[PDB]
Design an enzyme around this catalytic site. Structure first.
Site, PDB file in Angstrom:
ATOM      1  N   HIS A 167     -15.135  42.190  17.877  1.00 11.52           N
ATOM      2  CA  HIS A 167     -16.089  41.205  18.362  1.00 11.52           C
ATOM      3  C   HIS A 167     -15.407  39.960  18.961  1.00 11.52           C
ATOM      4  CE1 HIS A 167     -16.442  39.348  14.135  1.00 11.52           C
ATOM      5  NE2 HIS A 167     -15.963  38.368  14.895  1.00 11.52           N
ATOM      6  N   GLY A 220     -15.125  31.241  12.361  1.00 14.70           N
ATOM      7  CA  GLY A 220     -13.710  31.202  12.713  1.00 14.70           C
ATOM      8  C   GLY A 220     -12.825  31.919  11.708  1.00 14.70           C
ATOM      9  N   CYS A 251     -13.178  35.039  10.831  1.00 17.02           N
ATOM     10  CA  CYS A 251     -13.098  36.458  11.158  1.00 17.02           C
ATOM     11  C   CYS A 251     -11.686  36.896  11.507  1.00 17.02           C
ATOM     12  CB  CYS A 251     -14.105  36.830  12.237  1.00 17.02           C
ATOM     13  SG  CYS A 251     -15.809  36.412  11.803  1.00 17.02           S
TER      14      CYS A 251
END
Ligand SMILES: CN(C)c1ccc(N(Cc2cccc(Cl)c2)C(=O)Cn2nnc3ccccc32)cc1
Ligand SMILES: CN(C)c1ccc(N(Cc2cccc(Cl)c2)C(=O)Cn2nnc3ccccc32)cc1
Lengths: 304, 304
Positions: free
Chosen positions: A41, A143, A145
């Site tokens: 993503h 943030g 991830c």
């Protein structure tokens, strides 16, 4: 003595944390050898997350669009590929800090340490477990991830988790290092029901053994039970069924304390039916299930 | 979202951990620059611990009796001195992994991360706090002495604690990095009463703010209180008195949530007088006091 929610030393994993930017999205990546692993993503905007066709969004991205920064130095992307829900960015430089590593897919009930990161920089480290509903009750902000979950066995770091998303209920979902999500979660911004959060029975038992090893013995009663009887009570309280495998796994703790596993089960049965009565066990007012029998033996023996 | 008992990344501290052996005693040392800091009781046997004259036991020790091993390589001891309850072993090599560092003496209520070590090797990392009675509720086994407690502010590691002993009650006592014990503890095997373990009120309040920021709002009531009224209830429940300094310290969390500090106090007052009623706050059935207002702001903002 003393029993703490102990995380593995994070140093070996800190040396692998890098920042990955694609377009306007910035998240974290794991740099092992000449490959940077990150959530696919990273190629999406927050609007793309509603209905993404990752294969289509990916065609519009080249190696030069993936900005990888290790510390304050840029890394050169010489290849990119999508493996399930993770991107593998081939860089021209092998991480000189790469530890001995394995990618392992853990089962629910297993614990691991998470090194929460923002912009490739480690912010903190905490211990958590893969819930029976395949979520993790972490602490992640926007943030985070690409932050990884891991275990260490002396020098080998076994990477088990990479953070992908927060479900509307505040719980977390992610993949293993091969890009496969734990449970039925998908990297799409659609409400996904987490499922029943059951208590990891074998871990609660392990933690009751740790309490006995550490002096907290008030909850020890004069009763015993059978696996079938215990499981009737465990079902009623949304506790996972205790198997003969779990009993065998609790063998070493049962030996060390002299308390047979079914006697500890009867103690657990009474704690479920009667409550703590304002009392604590290892400084906790609830039954802790994020310590496996291996974690108790490790912490009580001093494995480094 | 999500609130975890998060420890600082331990990497910077792992690179300073060394093994110190004197006679038959093996414990841990902290190697910063060309100095190795360790508990002075490294010169004692378990029999010496009953009544040690450290200055006398020390005269019988030379530089060559202090075996310092960093990883699997021996370090050369070129000097030794006793500073309060710590030994400073001057080595001929500056630690090439020395981070930016400070030695700070913390106050009770302050939290820090501990990197539990055995034979110079890090075993685990957990977050704890200096209790109002100057003990720490850690997780240490025989051989953990010399493990350090620390905080990080970007790149500067502030060392605040070094582990020395376990009191008969299972709690822990240690010094700051200048060798001064926290509280009235002495490095002598005599029963030492820990003192009343009060709850760090400002930290509980900070943790109630974290719960509101993270969605747990059930405990929010329609009441307010005064500092004087709140402190009457806090005294009754063995909670530390809340000062105007603590109120100011909770200002940023009060601003972020829109809940005035005294309104949160009234909420806390009701939780003390009525109990949790089988409910939880941030997955806990008791009021957590090992998160300072700085820790909540740090974890909720994502400081790296
Ligand atoms: C790349 N992009 C701009 C983007 C933007 C947002 C997300 N989402 C939403 C989302 C997407 C997909 C599925 C589901 Cl259920 C939720 C996340 O949940 C990401 N995330 N991870 N942990 C978090 C903690 C706090 C806040 C956000 C957090 C993912 C990707
Ligand atoms: C060097 N020598 C042989 C030695 C041997 C024993 C100790 N003691 C006893 C002791 C001494 C002094 C004071 C008081 Cl209150 C207790 C410790 O308490 C050391 N220790 N630290 N954390 C521990 C956790 C589990 C088991 C032992 C632990 C210190 C020194």
């Amino acid at each position: 003595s003393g029993f703490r929610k102990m995380a593995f030393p994070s140093g070996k994993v800190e040396g692998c944390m890098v920042q990955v930017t694609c377009g306007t999205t910035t998240l974290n990546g794991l740099w092992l050898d000449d490959v940077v692993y990150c959530p696919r993503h990273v190629i999406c905007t927050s609007e793309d997350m509603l209905n993404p066709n990752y294969e289509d969004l990916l065609i519009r991205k080249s190696n030069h669009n993936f900005l990888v920064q290790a510390g304050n130095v840029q890394l050169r992307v010489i290849g990119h590929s999508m493996q399930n829900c993770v991107l593998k960015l081939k860089v021209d430089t092998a991480n000189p800090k790469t530890p001995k590593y394995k990618f392992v897919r853990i089962q629910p009930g297993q614990t691991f340490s998470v090194l929460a990161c923002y912009n490739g920089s480690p912010s903190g480290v905490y211990q958590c477990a893969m819930r029976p509903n395949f979520t993790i009750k972490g602490s992640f902000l926007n943030g985070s991830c690409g932050s990884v979950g891991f275990n260490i066995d002396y020098d080998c770091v076994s990477f088990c988790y990479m953070h992908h998303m927060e479900l509307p209920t505040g719980v977390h979902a992610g993949t293993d290092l091969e890009g496969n999500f734990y449970g039925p979660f998908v990297d799409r911004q659609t409400a996904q029901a987490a499922g029943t959060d059951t208590t990891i029975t074998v871990n609660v038992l392990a933690w009751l053994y740790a309490a006995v090893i550490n002096g907290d013995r008030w909850f020890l009663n004069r009763f015993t039970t059978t696996l079938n009887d215990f499981n009737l009570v465990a079902m009623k309280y949304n506790y996972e069924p205790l198997t003969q495998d779990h009993v065998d796994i609790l063998g070493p703790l049962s030996a060390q304390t002299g308390i047979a596993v079914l006697d500890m089960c009867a103690s657990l049965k009474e704690l479920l039916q009667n409550g703590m009565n304002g009392r604590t066990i290892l400084g906790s007012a609830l039954l802790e299930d994020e310590f496996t029998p291996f974690d108790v033996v490790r912490q009580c023996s001093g494995v480094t």
